[PDB]
Amino acid sequence: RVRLVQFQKNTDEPMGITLKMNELNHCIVARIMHGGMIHRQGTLHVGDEIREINGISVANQTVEQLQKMLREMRGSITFKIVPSYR
């Protein structure tokens, strides 16, 4: 049910995904820009839920704080996710 994934953010390029909070206050990958960083690395897919970012719980963060945290982060990044299924 829970998966650990990793990706590399070594430039100033955006991740190229959009996030939304749903009714359970869960952080959901809503759209993925084709050709963008996440799309190329295959790290996340639409409907996946992000639980943690580098071991940092998403639950006690606002959407702005998450956006700022992700924009500024660099290097090897680990997500704990709840994957969606086709």
């Binding site: 959009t18 996030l19 702005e64 992700l70």
Partner: peptide
């Protein structure tokens, strides 16, 4: 609302 990262 949606948020870009």
């Amino acid at each position: 609302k949606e948020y870009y990262v």
